[model samples]
Target: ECKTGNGKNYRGTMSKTKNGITCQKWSSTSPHRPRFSPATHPSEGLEENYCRNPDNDPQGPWCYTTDPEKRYDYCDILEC
Candidate 1:
């Protein structure tokens, strides 16, 4: 896990090729913040999962979809 302060941003890569599994957390002074959750998997593909603080957003901690069309507006740590 990593911790960052307000007014700052971060970026990195976490892959099954090296790290096996990864997770993240984001916090800000603003009421709104980003979230991440377990992604989908093929029965034969490598297993992977993600999670965020559920207390931060009760309706969220939502996983990203495999659909590229639906991902355009999302902010991911990899995008930083």
Candidate 2:
């Protein structure tokens, strides 16, 4: 999760034990921006496991919003 502001915003991470889902919280300095992207950081995993479909594309890839007006992109291997 993210927040839009003049630049003094912050983001955090939290994990849930029940479903083993990690959640993020953006500081309340601005409007919530639910932008999501493939895990591109070296410490993170690939997009195949995060998307709705994995086997549709053999090559692991990432998808992101090319249009700034759209805040979200459903990254998947097939989307590449």
Candidate 3:
């Protein structure tokens, strides 16, 4: 499924970043300890490696990348 605007409501399983980087799961704390999580921000829908916009970022839904060097990046989610 696609998202609208900032993708604050996006719940699709878009685990890969636009740069072809795999997203880290919200529940994991390996490379990144995300500020948003199912335990912290339950209403944001931070599931698996899916892209989400818990912070209401202007660029839209994104996630923390598996690469330790890269903190985060935007997803390739198209507008609805």
Highest TM-score model number: 3
Every candidate's lDDT: 0.26, 0.25, 0.89
**lDDT tens per residue, model 2, 1-80:** 32223111212121221133322221111223323323324223223223221123232222222233432232211110
RMSD of each: 15.2, 16.3, 0.8
Clashes of 3: 0
Superposed by TM-score, candidate 1 places the C-alpha of residue 13 at a distance from the truth, in angstroms, of 22
Superposed model 1: Cα runs more than 4 Å off? 1-47, 50-55, 72-80
Tens-place lDDT digits, model 1, residues 20-64: 222222222112233322232222111232322223333322223
Q: lDDT of candidate 3 vs native? A: 0.89
- In model 2, the runs with Cα more than 4 Å from the true position are 1-41, 45-63, 76-80
| Model 1 residue 23 CA deviation in Å | 14
Per-residue error for 46 in candidate 2, Å, reads 8.1
Clashing residue pairs found in predicted model 1: none
- TM-score, candidate number 2: 0.21
| Model 3, residue 80: C-alpha shift (Å) | 1.2
